[PDB]
Amino acid sequence: SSSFSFGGFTFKRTSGSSVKREEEVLTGNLQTLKIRVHEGYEEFTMVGRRATAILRKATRRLIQLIVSGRDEQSIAEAIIVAMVFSQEDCMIKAVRGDLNFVNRANQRLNPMHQLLRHFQKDAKVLFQNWGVEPIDNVMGMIGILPDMTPSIEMSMRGVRISK
Numbered sequence: 001s002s003s004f005s006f007g008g009f010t011f012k013r014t015s016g017s018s019v020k021r022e023e024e025v026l027t028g029n030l031q032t033l034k035i036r037v038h039e040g041y042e043e044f045t046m047v048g049r050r051a052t053a054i055l056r057k058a059t060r061r062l063i064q065l066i067v068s069g070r071d072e073q074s075i076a077e078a079i080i081v082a083m084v085f086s087q088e089d090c091m092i093k094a095v096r097g098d099l100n101f102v103n104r105a106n107q108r109l110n111p112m113h114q115l116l117r118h119f120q121k122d123a124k125v126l127f128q129n130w131g132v133e134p135i136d137n138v139m140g141m142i143g144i145l146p147d148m149t150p151s152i153e154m155s156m157r158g159v160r161i162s163k
Contacts, residue, residue: 007081016042050074062086068163
């Protein structure tokens, strides 16, 4: 039906539904945010000049993120955007400080953009609370660790690398 841009990446759905839903979450700084949650399985591609990815997800959970990029750091940039987009609660909980990002008109960025801006600042807490898991490298799936170390043994939950 159509694309969009978020976090410096063009998104493009390739399966799943666009119904809305409101939910209140609580950050790790005890601030309340009101977010628009897509309930159901949806699948997107993500494209930016130094990385591209496939993102599969369901309700407030990332199923799978396969990413390719020029290197570890361009790959990390794809990962942070997908984690924020996932909307998972370990993501919401990784927030420190109040989020009050604004445009040049002193209007609030929307809640999703509040999260994105926070984690673009720095994703260390995000990555450390996300969860790691074993990988099968007999299937060619490369892993990446919370510190950006590539590994053939583990990876941050749901994340795999392919270039």
